[PDB]
Design a protein around this nucleic acid. Structure first.
Lengths: 49, 86
RNA sequence: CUCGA
DNA sequence: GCATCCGTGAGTCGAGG
DNA sequence: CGTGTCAGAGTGTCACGGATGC
């Protein structure tokens, strides 16, 4: 659904490809560990904040 | 034996990883000084290491015992010595 | 904080 | 081997808060 | 003194050089 919305530009096709991690429960923990470091990352502790 | 004393240190290192960083943000709002919150965290977990009753029951919330110990330390720090000078 | 050359 | 990022600097004097 | 839910900061400079780093 991301490629469907941002497909008309080549600068967004280069973003999802250069991306490091994929997954709904994966990039949600990636945000948790950079925002509140030092805490255990739970799929539902990042879904909450 | 010697491996039994090392299990006590591996037990403390566990509660650090789940509660210390969350307890730090609690003391930070109560005091406002980040360097003071670290002082509250070390004193709180030091009393956890001295109270085996709080580390005994995992079926009882141990995180909450910390937030009230931190509350009592900050309200005691909030007495006479801080009153005049701060 | 606010102003004077 | 180089782009990044950190740390450095950014007029002088005076009056009242 | 004893302590057993959880509640959680400021954000409109920039030029310039060189050590720092993927």
């Amino acid at each position: 659904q991301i490629v469907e919305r941002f497909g008309f530009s080549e600068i967004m096709r280069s973003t999802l490809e250069k991306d490091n991690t994929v997954g709904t429960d994966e990039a949600l923990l990636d945000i948790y560990r950079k925002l509140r470091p030092g805490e255990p990352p739970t799929k539902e502790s990042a879904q909450t904040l | 034996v010697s491996g039994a004393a090392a299990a006590e240190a591996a037990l403390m290192r566990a509660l650090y990883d789940e509660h210390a960083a969350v307890l730090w943000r609690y003391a930070l709002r109560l005091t406002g000084d980040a360097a003071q919150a670290e002082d509250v965290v070390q004193e709180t977990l030091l009393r956890a290491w001295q109270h085996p009753e709080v580390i005994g029951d995992t079926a009882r919330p141990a995180r909450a015992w910390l937030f009230t110990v931190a509350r009592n330390m900050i309200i005691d720090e909030r007495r006479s010595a801080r009153f005049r000078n701060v």
